Structure formats: structure tokens, C-alpha cells
Amino acid sequence: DCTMYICGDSTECSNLLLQYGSFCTQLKRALTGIAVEQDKNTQEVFAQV
Amino acid sequence: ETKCTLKSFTVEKGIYQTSNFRVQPTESIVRFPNITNLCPFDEVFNAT
Numbered sequence: 615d616c617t618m619y620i621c622g623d624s625t626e627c628s629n630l631l632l633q634y635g636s637f638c639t640q641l642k643r644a645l646t647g648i649a650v651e652q653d654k655n656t657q658e659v660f661a662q663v
Numbered sequence: 664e665t666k667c668t669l670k671s672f673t674v675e676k677g678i679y680q681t682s683n684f685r686v687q688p689t690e691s692i693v694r695f696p697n698i699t700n701l702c703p704f705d706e707v708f709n710a711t
Contacts, residue, residue: 617683618683623685642680646680
């Protein structure tokens with residue numbers, strides 16, 4: 615989560631972070647893709663019957 | 664909220680991840696600097 619890690623649950627910090635744009639929508643998608651891939655790997659290896 | 668965080672009016676089936684979850688703290692506690700000895704202003708103000 616960007617909001618808590620970069621900013622200590624502040625408000626002006628959140629407003630300043632809002633200026634950078636989509637530097638988290640890019641980050642929050644790669645991890646979800648990795649998680650989906652990891653969940654698919656074990657299903658591919660074992661589910662063969 | 665799911666539509667808002669996806670910038671679209673149509674959402675397909677699945678599980679998504681919306682905004683974070685937090686609990687708002689209430690009230691406040693203020694602590695004075697730990698000094699208690701009183702300044703003796705009685706002598707200067709009241710002297711014989």
C-alpha cells in the first residue's frame with residue numbers, strides 16, 4: 615500500500631503524493647499479476663487428473 | 664467505489680481491490696514539560 619508506507623497516515627503528505635500521478639497503479643498491478651501467476655503455477659503442476 | 668478506482672462504468676466479474684481501511688483515532692492527550700517547582704514571585708511583588 616502506497617499511502618501508509620510512503621506517508622505516515624498524514625494529510626499534506628497525501629496531497630503532495632497525489633501530484634506524482636500513477637506511480638502506484640503501475641506498482642499495484644505487477645504484484646497482483648505475480649500473485650495470480652503463483653496461484654496458477656501450483657494448479658498447473660498438480661491438477662493433472 | 665470499484666467503478667471509481669477503475670475509471671470505467673462497466674466492471675466484469677471477479678475480485679478487485681478498492682481503497683484502504685483505517686480506524687480514526689478520537690480525543691487527544693497533552694503532556695506538559697515535566698517541571699513543577701514554582702517561581703517565587705511573592706518576594707519581588709510583595710516586599711516590606
